[PDB]
């Protein structure tokens with residue numbers, strides 16, 4: 001079988017929906033983060049999620065060397081946070097965490113305390129696939145905001161949820 | 165750093181949101197599918213998605229032995245499909261695919277033609293982590309309905325999308 005064209009693959013994907021997260025890190029290699037939607041739960045013992053991140057990025061370099069990271073599922077009101085960590089407005093990497101919303105929990109990685117879900121994590125394993133590092137991370141702390149319907153991405157726009 | 169309790173992990177995840185897919189298969193080891201939300205795109209060259217499925221699933225062994233599968237992102241109108249494939253009504257596998265909305269495209273796996281997005285795939289890699297097989301699959305064909313509006317899962321209920 002022949003795989004679909006890359007362009008057709010991305011077009012089709014725009015028609016699926018995802019949550020939106022920010023993955024962030026800090027430690028001896030410094031502070032960094034990027035917006036990431038390719039994230040999912042893997043198993044509960046040990047509690048493990050994975051995230052797939054293009055290895056060419058500033059943030060990927062730092063995340064992999066710090067060896068710790070946070071995954072921060074954004075609430076409906078946080079599209080600007082997502083835009084910032086996707087590089088909309090070209091906000092310099094270390095200027096991205098200037099606000100009380102980020103604090104430390106267990107690892108030293110910055111946690112978004114008003115995110116719908118925040119997992120503080122250590123990296124356990126990495127599987128490289130084409131351009132992306134698939135990073136398997138074990139959850140060593142969790143946090144939740146009070147009142148957060150999700151930020152959703154779909155058809156290249158942000159959205160949130162409503163009952164069926 | 166000690167990991168969080170499994171129970172905390174699961175609770176936290178209920179507060180995140182995910183699309184809802186049905187992962188289906190067919191071939192020499194038979195028909196099977198199940199509903200899966202632990203799915204994401206990995207890279208576009210080659211076009212690869214991954215999905216995490218509990219090895220306890222009846223459908224897991226059949227999917228991995230057939231070597232082929234589809235991922236079907238369900239639309240807002242399709243909660244009954246999600247329910248059928250999560251085992252509600254305990255519908256027998258073959259009978260799950262009796263409806264003519266399920267066709268073959270390229271691999272032989274059943275593809276839901278009216279699903280918001282359907283990727284027909286061949287398995288490329290399987291990495292077993294805790295209770296789950298993380299299955300990497302390369303996209304060989306696709307199909308999309310005209311209706312992309314997502315079925316979403318969140319706080320243990322179905323939802324769909326709204327503008328912000």
Ligand SMILES: Cc1cc2nc3c(=O)[nH]c(=O)nc-3n(C[C@H](O)[C@H](O)[C@H](O)COP(=O)(O)OP(=O)(O)OC[C@H]3O[C@@H](n4cnc5c(N)ncnc54)[C@H](O)[C@@H]3O)c2cc1C
Pocket residue numbers: 184198199200201202203216217218219220221222223246249250251252254255256257317
């Ligand atoms: C919103 C949502 C998201 C989900 N996400 C995931 C996910 O990301 N990963 C995951 O692993 N699960 C996921 N699930 C769970 C999943 O879909 C199922 O609910 C789970 O696998 C249990 O399904 P089952 O009741 O069909 O049990 P199973 O044991 O998996 O199978 C039972 C029924 O289906 C298949 N049969 C069973 N035994 C035999 C036999 N001895 N001989 C011949 N035929 C047999 C069975 O045949 C039977 O019809 C999700 C469910 C929901 C609702």
Ligand SMILES: Cc1cc2nc3c(=O)[nH]c(=O)nc-3n(C[C@H](O)[C@H](O)[C@H](O)COP(=O)(O)OP(=O)(O)OC[C@H]3O[C@H](n4cnc5c(N)ncnc54)[C@H](O)[C@@H]3O)c2cc1C
Pocket residue numbers: 020034035036037038039052053054057082083085086087131153
């Ligand atoms: C809602 C959203 C989700 C994103 N998810 C991821 C992800 O899971 N993994 C990742 O490495 N980067 C993701 N990004 C990209 C990322 O956050 C930065 O924008 C990127 O590192 C910036 O580099 P660039 O200027 O070359 O932009 P780009 O040329 O746009 O980025 C190029 C490469 O890194 C960025 N991938 C996966 N989903 C998306 C997406 N919806 N939009 C754009 N790129 C995507 C890509 O993945 C791609 O391989 C996402 C961006 C947004 C807005």
